[PDB]
Amino acid sequence: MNDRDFMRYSRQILLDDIALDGQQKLLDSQVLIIGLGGLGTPAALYLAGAGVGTLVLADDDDVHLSNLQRQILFTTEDIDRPKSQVSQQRLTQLNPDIQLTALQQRLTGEALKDAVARADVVLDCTDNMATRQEINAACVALNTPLITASAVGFGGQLMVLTPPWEQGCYRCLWPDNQEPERNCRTAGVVGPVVGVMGTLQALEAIKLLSGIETPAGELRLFDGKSSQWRSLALRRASGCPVCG
Amino acid sequence: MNDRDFMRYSRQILLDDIALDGQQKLLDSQVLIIGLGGLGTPAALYLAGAGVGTLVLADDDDVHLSNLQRQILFTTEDIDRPKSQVSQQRLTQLNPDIQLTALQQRLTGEALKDAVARADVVLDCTDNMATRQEINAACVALNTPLITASAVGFGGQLMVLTPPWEQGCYRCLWAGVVGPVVGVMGTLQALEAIKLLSGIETPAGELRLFDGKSSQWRSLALRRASGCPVC
Ligand SMILES: [Zn+2]
Ligand SMILES: [Zn+2]
């Protein structure tokens, strides 16, 4: 690569586990981020700056004042402007040497499928159970990893699902499809909490793409209130509508 | 608190643990963020969007290409501009309704003690063992809570030291980095500030360590050193 790119990616390249090799891998890698909010926003911000070759940002909503408290990528001046655009645009100003696509739609059906297909890794950053479900289905089908997370109030939840599908899919831990019983406090959310969650979704994407020994198949839980971390093991359904 | 304000802070206000009581508290607080790097950058960003009344951005340095990989608050286009200025400007675009004071200088001795005094919580975001040491001194002198962090390669470190100074100060205790690893640490530094300024209970007498490769946290029990030169 370049002698400049070296400087920019200096902090990663200088790392044994990544070095020049991985750094190229990152540059040759592609990542799909469905949803650019308090979760996908810092996810995209850190991936671009890390040098992920390609980034597809999908989000069908505009920038609202209500967002600025946790969706750090945006600015008040961006209000009413479509997220995907504003996003790609600002990420560009950060890392021009990388390609950024902006889908101003809702990824579904085949539009979501092939989109998933390509991607070497797919981050789910839609705090939506339905979407998350088909993103999972699609991911399982076109054997492409899914790194899903979420947050409500002071609580965070993260999960990495690799293609081998060892410990099953999201439709294993929740063969259902409706909603969880955390539907109560679904009122607000602390920025740092949803933030740390997305940021971690990116660390997991890097490690996955740069082929690092990152444990998966867990369900990490964060309690922003007690500032305590916790992990629940996983194992697939003895006959899931997927992963079967 | 008008229509606009209710709207931006709405996801925080609709929270039992904060509501108008806390949102109001945040808006009356001042936080000193010393250092605007991989740590300070996301911290300032999350605190501002949160609505902390006054933010003092300290940092005697300019943007560099190297930076852009972990310091998410800057772009290539600010490459030679000073950070405190660039931060101050970008943060205002996010929340014009809060007090944002830049500090293109380098705090030390008195210049530091003043800033620490006029500040509810101080965030040590200077990955420099030295500045760090002076701050811990100032923070204990003016019994001002100190949230400090670190992040090297794949491992981060976090600590919340408060006034009763029960389990020690930073003395009582004592070059590549992954983007997200410093981030997590910084974002968490904000989380602790918001919990401290809003009044939420937070076990703090420990040294949280994060290993971003194995993806697991560990803690060490702090202890105020016998005859510590500050405690
Ligand atoms: Zn399954
Ligand atoms: Zn001490």
Under 8 Å CB-to-CB from A210, ≥6 apart: which residues? A17, A18, A22, A23, A25, A26
Helix, strand, or coil (residue B25): helix
Euclidean distance between CA atoms B55 and A64, whole angstroms = 23
A111/chain B closest Cα distance in angstroms:
30
Under 8 Å CB-to-CB from A105, ≥6 apart: which residues? A58, A60, A111
Euclidean distance between CA atoms A145 and B52, whole angstroms = 38
A92/chain B closest Cα distance in angstroms:
8
Is the CB of residue A9 less than 8 Å from the CB of residue B69? yes
In the block, residue with structure tokens 């608190």: B1
Out of B46, B180, B187, whose CB is closest to A206?
A: B180
**Phi, psi at A71, each rounded to 5°:** -90, 75
Is the CB of residue A205 less than 8 Å from the CB of residue A31? yes
Is the CB of residue B196 less than 8 Å from the CB of residue B139? no
The sign of the CA dihedral B91, B93, B95, B99 is positive
Euclidean distance between CA atoms B6 and A143, whole angstroms = 44
Query: For the residues of A199-229, what is the DSSP string, one character each?
Result: HHHHHHHHHHHTT-----S-EEEEETTTTEE
A220 touching chain B per CB within 8 A: yes
The experimental technique behind this entry is X-ray
Q: Please tell me which residue of chain B has the smallest CA distance to A93.
A: B75
- Please work out, in degrees rounded to the nearest 5, the angle formed at the alpha carbon of residue B29 by the alpha carbons of B25 and B33: 140
Distance B161 CA to ligand 2 centre (A): 10
How is the beta sheet containing B155-161 ordered, strand by strand?
Answer: B99-103, B54-58, B30-34, B121-124, B146-152, B155-161, B206-211, B216-221
Euclidean distance between CA atoms A47 and B195, whole angstroms = 28
Which CATH topology does A1-244 take?
Rossmann fold (3.40.50)
Helix, strand, or coil (residue B78): helix
Q: Centre a 10 Å sphere on the Cβ of residue B89 and count the other Cβ atoms it contains.
A: 13
B141 touching chain A per CB within 8 A: no
B25/chain A closest Cα distance in angstroms:
15
Across chain A, the runs of DSSP E, i.e. the strands, are 30-34, 54-58, 99-103, 121-124, 146-152, 155-161, 219-223, 228-232
| Domain spans of chain B, in order of start | 1-231
Q: Please tell me which residue of chain A has the smallest CA distance to B43.
A: A192
What are the structure tokens assigned to A103, written together? 């889908």
**Per residue, what are the HEC states of B139-191?**
HHHCCCCEEEEEEEECEEEEEEECCCCCCCCCCCCCCCECHHHHHHHHHHHHH
Euclidean distance between CA atoms A14 and A20, whole angstroms = 8
Euclidean distance between CA atoms B179 and B222, whole angstroms = 28
Helix, strand, or coil (residue A71): coil
Euclidean distance between CA atoms B146 and B122, whole angstroms = 5
Beta bridge partners of A30: A54
Beta bridge partners of B146: B122, B161
Euclidean distance between CA atoms B175 and B177, whole angstroms = 7
Query: For the residues of A9-36, what is the DSSP string, one character each?
Result: THHHHTSTTTHHHHHHHHHH-EEEEE--
Q: Are strands B30-34 and B216-221 parallel, antiparallel or unpaired?
A: unpaired
Helix, strand, or coil (residue B55): strand
Catalytic site residue from A4, A178, A183, A184: A184
CATH number corresponding to B1-231 = 3.40.50.720
Q: Which amino acid is at B52?
A: V
The verdict on whether residue B112 carries a ligand-binding annotation is: no
A50 touching chain B per CB within 8 A: yes
Under 8 Å CB-to-CB from B128, ≥6 apart: which residues? B35
Element (H, E) at B42: helix B40-50
How is the beta sheet containing A146-152 ordered, strand by strand?
Answer: A99-103, A54-58, A30-34, A121-124, A146-152, A155-161, A219-223, A228-232
Among A178, A180, A179, A146, which residue's Cα sits nearest to residue A161?
A146
What are the structure tokens assigned to B105, written together? 């200088």
- What resolution in Å is listed for this PDB structure? 3.0
